[PDB]
């Protein structure tokens, strides 16, 4: 389609359009976690399927996640593409939320995680934190480059406006390196070492797309959270993702 903002020498291979009243998330296309409080990184919220406790829909063309204090609990949603893909131009327009403690992330997995993580790999595309407000970054995850090693692969940058407006986030994959941009300009390189090595390259091997909304957490949460700030959406235009013609 001549409408789709296309990188040179890709085509369109998959597209999550999201296409004014709310409906459900086309369950072809993502399948949802059920996870209590504290299953990962000691986050805060509960990830549920969905009264108007309904955390994940589709309104105006776009996927909105929603932070929502029900009872004693915060209420969120995350998601996982049911297709998965080696290799590519992953593109999403994404709107923070606004909070203290917040944690929207838009990032990848692979399917095979037999080797566990971080050994299995992992591509951070979009990430981001209600505590430090418009500073997004992307990272690589394995087992020469993580947080426990303090070796991390990362790359930082503030956009203004970022919490309350659309931006385009992307990550171009190839097997040769990974990058990401923020609005068509590059942010984060990891280059392919070309040493064949799984320590510092499992990224050889299909990912599929992860969208959430934490609350809290390792990251989210180190500075405290402010349940003030609730309701608060992560709101998601399209996800599309291109490979190499
Ligand atoms: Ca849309």
């Not at 949603?77 to 893909?85: H, P």
């Not at 990032?107 to 997004?136: L, S």
């Not at 097997?175 to 942010?187: E, M, S, W």
Request: charged share 20%; with cysteine; proline share 6%.
């Amino acid at each position: 389609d001549p409408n789709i903002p296309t990188p040179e020498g890709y085509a369109l291979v998959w597209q999550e359009e999201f296409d004014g009243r709310p409906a459900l998330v086309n369950a072809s296309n993502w399948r949802f976690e059920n996870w209590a409080p504290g299953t990962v990184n000691n986050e805060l919220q509960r990830y549920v399927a969905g009264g108007n406790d309904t955390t994940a829909m589709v309104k105006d063309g776009a996927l909105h996640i929603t932070l929502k204090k029900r009872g004693n609990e915060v209420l969120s949603a995350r998601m996982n593409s049911r297709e998965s893909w080696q290799y590519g131009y992953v593109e999403a327009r994404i709107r923070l939320p606004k909070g203290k403690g917040t944690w929207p992330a838009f990032w990848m997995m692979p399917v095979d995680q037999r080797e566990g993580w971080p050994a299995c790999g992992e591509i951070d595309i979009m990430e981001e934190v209600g505590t430090n407000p418009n500073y997004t970054s992307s990272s690589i995850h394995c087992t020469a480059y993580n947080h426990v090693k303090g070796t991390q692969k990362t790359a930082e940058r503030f956009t203004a406006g970022a919490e309350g407006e659309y931006h385009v986030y992307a990550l171009e994959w190839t097997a040769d390196y990974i990058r990401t941009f923020v609005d068509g300009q590059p942010l984060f390189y990891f280059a392919n070492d070309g040493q064949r090595k799984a320590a510092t390259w499992p990224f050889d091997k299909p990912f599929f797309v992860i969208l959430n909304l934490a609350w809290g957490g390792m990251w989210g949460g180190m500075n405290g959270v402010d349940e003030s700030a609730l309701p608060t959406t992560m709101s998601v235009d399209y996800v599309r993702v291109f490979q190499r013609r």
